[PDB]
Amino acid sequence: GSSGSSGKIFTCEYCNKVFKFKHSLQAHLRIHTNEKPYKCPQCSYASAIKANLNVHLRKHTGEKFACDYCSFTCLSKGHLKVHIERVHKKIK
Template sequence: MHALNCNYRKRAAHAIPAVLERHEKRHRDNRVVCIICGRRFSSQENLEVHKKVHTSAKLYECDVCGQCFNVLSNMKRHRNLHSGTAGQHTCPDCGRAFHQKSHLRSHIRTHTGERPFQCSQCNERFTEIGSVRKHERMMHEGVYPHYCPYCNKGLANGYKLRMHADACYRRQMKEDATQTT
């Protein structure tokens, strides 16, 4: 069975037509965009919930450790970390604790300098397979995780998007002001 191409990303996505249709529906449904980070949502309501992560007001407090969050679901996810398995994987070099063994393995590579994952198209090496995939998408396919809502430029991370989008917004406001005078 061969993979079918996603019409939105123009690359192989799924081998089963029904699964591909569900995948493409997510592209069609995610039309509402956060202007701060570029993340897409299927409804204005979901965007409004998301916007809270960009505010400084932290209304939800973890009843175990007191850490505060601006989104209830983030606080609940954090609170689950306080279970009996929390931090059971400890780095022998620096003592930092991790909830998952895979995160500890990845962290240890920061001490050893090991970079076992290589890009299939160039000689760049990485500590995590996810970093290879992100590199290949951005550097070799031109697909970025964040896009400016004003000029559609692709950016590597949310911080760069916020800085760029802010500059684009100010430039656009300046241009609009000069056109109306």
């Protein structure tokens, strides 16, 4: 079990989420923004373009795997793991 201190906490007033760091919540709020006319039914994915959406939707194939560190989503699982060892890591 992790053992450390904790002053304050950052809670998201959108999806009742929580983030240890601040920058995490800020960048996260990104998905919590609807300024485009075309919105995605699956997620909060929106784009002024029409095609972009059509292609995006295709991405939704059952269940995606979101990164524990960042908000990176991948179709496969194994890839996600490597993404954390390559992106969130620079040591073989």
